[PDB]
Design a binder for this molecule. Structure first.
Ligand SMILES: CC(C)[C@H](NC(=O)[C@H](C)NC(=O)OCc1ccccc1)C(=O)N[C@@H](Cc1ccccc1)[C@@H](O)[C@H](O)[C@H](Cc1ccccc1)NC(=O)[C@@H](NC(=O)[C@H](C)NC(=O)OCc1ccccc1)C(C)C
Ligand SMILES: CC(C)[C@H](NC(=O)[C@H](C)NC(=O)OCc1ccccc1)C(=O)N[C@@H](Cc1ccccc1)[C@@H](O)[C@H](O)[C@H](Cc1ccccc1)NC(=O)[C@@H](NC(=O)[C@H](C)NC(=O)OCc1ccccc1)C(C)C
Ligand SMILES: Cc1ccc(N)c(N)c1
Ligand SMILES: Cc1ccc(N)c(N)c1
Lengths: 99, 99
């Protein structure tokens, strides 16, 4: 689709059997989701932004559907206040910025 | 232009006579720039993100060129580590996400 920016670009995602909403975030290197259990093996990670840095759990080769577009890759889970879809997954679904 | 997301979407901006680079950030409600002097009247503001909240100075009706596209509006200045072009200005230059 083509998404405009008058509101926050929150779209529907599906991950580990659950439906969520997530922000398509061209300013996020990585994908970061609110707390949730996800399969198996993780390795710690730190991410920073405005205000500071948080500890997250990194999970590799995770399947995630983003508005009907399936992608497999790295998902981080931790104390973010919004689910964020970062460039790691945006590249996979073919996402571009246009103006 | 059409920008892909393999790298961070850092583009050239011009503000208050200076050339800078800034991230086109669909995850930022607001525009936020590293420390710099700018004309006249400001009113305090707080912004949050990952890790916490920072204090910024809000400036209204500021002219800013974003890759050749001129926009006037609110610019915040404060201790951000990257210059961020948020949705307030992205809407003005006609910026959309497409996939
Ligand atoms: C949601 C996060 C994944 C996001 N952060 C990131 O993408 C950051 C740069 N990448 C990031 O933290 O990666 C790990 C790292 C570890 C050590 C040193 C540096 C980087 C973010 O807060 N994004 C914001 C912009 C930003 C970038 C850097 C700093 C402050 C604000 C607005 O989009
Ligand atoms: C660069 C900032 C302007 C940016 N933040 C924002 O756009 C935030 C939501 N808006 C924001 O702080 O506005 C003011 C405010 C004041 C009181 C209460 C709530 C909001 C940001 O860190 N963006 C990041 C995603 C995000 C959003 C919320 C929280 C954590 C991460 C990655 O894009
Ligand atoms: C369900 C699942 C969990 C972790 C990994 N690493 C993979 N590939 C798949
Ligand atoms: C140069 C300049 C500074 C502040 C404001 N508010 C405006 N409009 C213009």
């Amino acid at each position: 689709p083509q998404i405009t920016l008058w509101k926050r670009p929150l779209v529907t995602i599906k991950i580990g059997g659950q439906l969520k909403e997530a922000l398509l975030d061209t300013g996020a290197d990585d994908t970061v989701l609110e707390e949730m259990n996800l399969p198996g093996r993780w390795k710690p990670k730190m991410i920073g932004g405005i205000g500071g840095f948080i500890k997250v759990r990194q999970y590799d080769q995770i399947l995630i559907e983003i508005c009907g577009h399936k992608a497999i890759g790295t998902v981080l889970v931790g104390p973010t206040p919004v689910n964020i879809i970062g460039r790691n997954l945006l590249t996979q679904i073919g996402c571009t910025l246009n103006f």
